[PDB]
Amino acid sequence: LPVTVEKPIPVVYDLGNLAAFDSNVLDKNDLDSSNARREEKIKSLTRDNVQLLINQLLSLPMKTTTESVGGTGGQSSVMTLLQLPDPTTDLPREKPLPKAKAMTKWEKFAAKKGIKPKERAGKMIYDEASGEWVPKWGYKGANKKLDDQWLVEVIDPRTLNRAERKRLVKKNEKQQRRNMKN
Amino acid sequence: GTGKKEKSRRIREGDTKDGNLRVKGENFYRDSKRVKFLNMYTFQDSTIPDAR
Amino acid sequence: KERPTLAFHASITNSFGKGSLIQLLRQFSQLHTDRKQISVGFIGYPNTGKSSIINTLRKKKVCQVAPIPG
Amino acid sequence: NARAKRALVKREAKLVENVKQALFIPGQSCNKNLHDIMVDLSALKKPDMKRFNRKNDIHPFEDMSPLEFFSEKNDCSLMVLMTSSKKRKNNMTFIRTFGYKIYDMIELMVADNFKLLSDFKKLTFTVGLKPMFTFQGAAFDTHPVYKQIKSLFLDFFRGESTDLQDVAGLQHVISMTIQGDFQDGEPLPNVLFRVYKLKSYKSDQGGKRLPRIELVEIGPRLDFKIGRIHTPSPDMVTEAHKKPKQKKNVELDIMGDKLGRIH
RNA sequence: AGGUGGGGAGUUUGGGGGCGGCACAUCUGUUAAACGAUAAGCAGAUGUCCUAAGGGGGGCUCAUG
Ligand SMILES: [Mg+2]
Numbered sequence A: 001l002p003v004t005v006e007k008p009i010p011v012v013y014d015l016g017n018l019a020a021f022d023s024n025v026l027d028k029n030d031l032d033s034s035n036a037r038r039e040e041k042i043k044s045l046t047r048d049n050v051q052l053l054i055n056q057l058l059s060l061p062m063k064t065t066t067e068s069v070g071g072t073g074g075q076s077s078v079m080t081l082l083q084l085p086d087p088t089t090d091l092p093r094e095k096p097l098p099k100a101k102a103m104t105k106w107e108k109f110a111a112k113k114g115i116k117p118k119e120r121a122g123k124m125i126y127d128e129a130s131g132e133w134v135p136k137w138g139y140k141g142a143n144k145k146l147d148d149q150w151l152v153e154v155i156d157p158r159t160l161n162r163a164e165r166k167r168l169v170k171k172n173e174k175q176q177r178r179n180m181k182n
Numbered sequence B: 001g002t003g004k005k006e007k008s009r010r011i012r013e014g015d016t017k018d019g020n021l022r023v024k025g026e027n028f029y030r031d032s033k034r035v036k037f038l039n040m041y042t043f044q045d046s047t048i049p050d051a052r
Numbered sequence C: 001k002e003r004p005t006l007a008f009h010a011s012i013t014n015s016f017g018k019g020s021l022i023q024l025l026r027q028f029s030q031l032h033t034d035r036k037q038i039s040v041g042f043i044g045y046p047n048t049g050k051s052s053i054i055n056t057l058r059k060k061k062v063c064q065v066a067p068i069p070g
Numbered sequence D: 001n002a003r004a005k006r007a008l009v010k011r012e013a014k015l016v017e018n019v020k021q022a023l024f025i026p027g028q029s030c031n032k033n034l035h036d037i038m039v040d041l042s043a044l045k046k047p048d049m050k051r052f053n054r055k056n057d058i059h060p061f062e063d064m065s066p067l068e069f070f071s072e073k074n075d076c077s078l079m080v081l082m083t084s085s086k087k088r089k090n091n092m093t094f095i096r097t098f099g100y101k102i103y104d105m106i107e108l109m110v111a112d113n114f115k116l117l118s119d120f121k122k123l124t125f126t127v128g129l130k131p132m133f134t135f136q137g138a139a140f141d142t143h144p145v146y147k148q149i150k151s152l153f154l155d156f157f158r159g160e161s162t163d164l165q166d167v168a169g170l171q172h173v174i175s176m177t178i179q180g181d182f183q184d185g186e187p188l189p190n191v192l193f194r195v196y197k198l199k200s201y202k203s204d205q206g207g208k209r210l211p212r213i214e215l216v217e218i219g220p221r222l223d224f225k226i227g228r229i230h231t232p233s234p235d236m237v238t239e240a241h242k243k244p245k246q247k248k249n250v251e252l253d254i255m256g257d258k259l260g261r262i263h
Numbered sequence E: 001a002g003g004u005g006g007g008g009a010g011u012u013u014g015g016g017g018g019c020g021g022c023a024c025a026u027c028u029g030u031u032a033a034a035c036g037a038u039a040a041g042c043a044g045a046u047g048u049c050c051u052a053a054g055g056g057g058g059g060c061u062c063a064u065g
Helices: A037-057 A105-112 A142-148 A157-180 B006-013 B015-021 B032-039 C018-031 C050-058 D002-011 D032-043 D065-074 D144-157 D234-240
Strands: A012-014 A019-022 A081-083 D022-026 D049-051 D078-082 D091-098 D101-110 D132-136 D164-166 D172-178 D191-201 D212-217 D222-230
Touching: A012 A037, A019 A037, A037 D132, A037 D172, A037 D191, A037 D212, A105 B015, A142 A157, B006 B015, C018 C050, D022 D032, D022 D065, D032 D049, D032 D078, D065 D078, D065 D091, D065 D101, D091 D144, D091 D234, D101 D144, D132 D144, D144 D172, D144 D222
Parallel strands: A019 D132, D022 D049, D022 D078, D132 D172
Antiparallel strands: A012 A019, A081 D164, D078 D091, D091 D101, D101 D222, D172 D191, D191 D212, D191 D222
16 A cells, blocks of 8 residues: 655666666575565566656656647647656667768759759749630640640641650659769 | 969869859959859849739 | 946057957857858947047057047 | 558658567467467557568578568568577577668577466556566666667567657556576576556555556566577667757747847 | 979950659550560550549459359
8 A cells, every 4th residue: 555665776767768777686586486476576576666667757747738629630638648758768770860862963053153942932834825824834734735736837846845845854864863873 | 374374273173074154253262152242343124024 | 237337448559358348249259150240339428438449449540539529 | 653652751761760660470480389479479569560471481590681681671670580499499589670781689588487468367458558667687787688688678669759648558567677686707597577557556645646556467477588699780889879960158048039148 | 304484475354044844545667575465665646634643531343264
């Protein structure tokens, strides 16, 4: 019934991972697998350690929001929660850091030149003779307008534009392949 | 020259491979980042933009 | 209670407190390292220390100084 | 096509790593007791648990390439392969992988006195909840082998790294103990693994602030014998401890105001 | 031999930043790997909503005997 627990050596706690360490002396006499009291001693030691960890864990602050269920990503105000601290144990990583980036020639040119990066304003470009935005790329853009239009006043020239666009795409792919070796 | 010549410096630095970006006044003193800044001390196109 | 209150003397060469003000300005510049530029303006009654303090900061007479308010 | 791209995105290294996936491979000598032990381990590893189709004939110590190949093809960082030889009775192997390459190898064997989960008293247990841990004995931190075992167990069972925990989430605790202390140079005593369910006895003696913690053992009860061990090189250890790198007289005061000290 | 080499001389010092963008039911020349099936692209009358990704939700199971 009593909850008091104490040890001679101060206990080390890892609240960031719900773990604790107890460097206290281990009783080899009773820990032997052949002993029957072994199980009871292990149970008592585990209970004491868990009591100490819970006492230390509950001392952490707890958040209390004023919101409601709301969306699926919300949190209920009623559910009190303990704010755990940052992790302390430096567990080994599983993969390296992908700090490597693309050294494409464009970045070097931009660094050398004063050309600031594009602001990515939007897809809605403007055209004429249609009374509509007709965005550049994304849905029935001006790229296919030259093929769709039925007057090419200037041998089939409609296919030549598509061939030129495909050649530009191939050139972009070749540039990508060349930069992949950086 | 020989070292004083800017051609030798360009060859040594390897910028000749990308000489297309040669800025007017490319020298050891006051490189492009400074030449362009100073050129501003040397806006009235009256263009008609479509404010849509 | 509300200001640093740096003691200063406006002697052109035998200035007092110049080092403290220089250190304060250096600290302010360190705070604004990302700005790369900063300027300090002077406010006060005429002929108090403005031109003389500026000159002693520069260590030489640059701005005209005389016992005259203007 | 986007489905494959989503998987490849997870395959690539992430700044914040998710729960380390565990792959279980039954060896050529997958005993029925070994199968039960694997099932019990999976019960404490779900839902981030994967089991192979059938038996295997892979020797991690005599063949490291197959483990790396399986990890790469399954994107699993943690690997477990249970295999018991005539000399190494009830032996179980645990392996970690860094960048699809072998990180370390450790042999763990369970004594015949082990008790399965079904043998213990039935109690509620929710999958996916992060359990608590308790380490007893200075050897856990003062010894290399025990430190590695502790790190492996934590990485296997620490689950997510969330900074917010529910009070009701503390359902059970894992007791990590050793078979008594030992002198320098002596054989390493077997590691004792126990799992205890938590009971919230009223705080009559402890007033209201803290309840009387009670424990009920549910198993599995395992004593881990120490066999062959492999460790990574210092360079690999340093690589595995890298940080994402994510200010003189600069501090963000309350309300987000950027204040400083004049000195 | 190599090097400093407007210290010296002749000369100019013109008239310009963003852009590429489509996926499936089709048939034709190459590809065709040659007892063949007919694939992994090129360009084409061909559309179509898959809003240039099919993301979710609810259902069906399939070549071939
Ligand atoms: Mg004055």
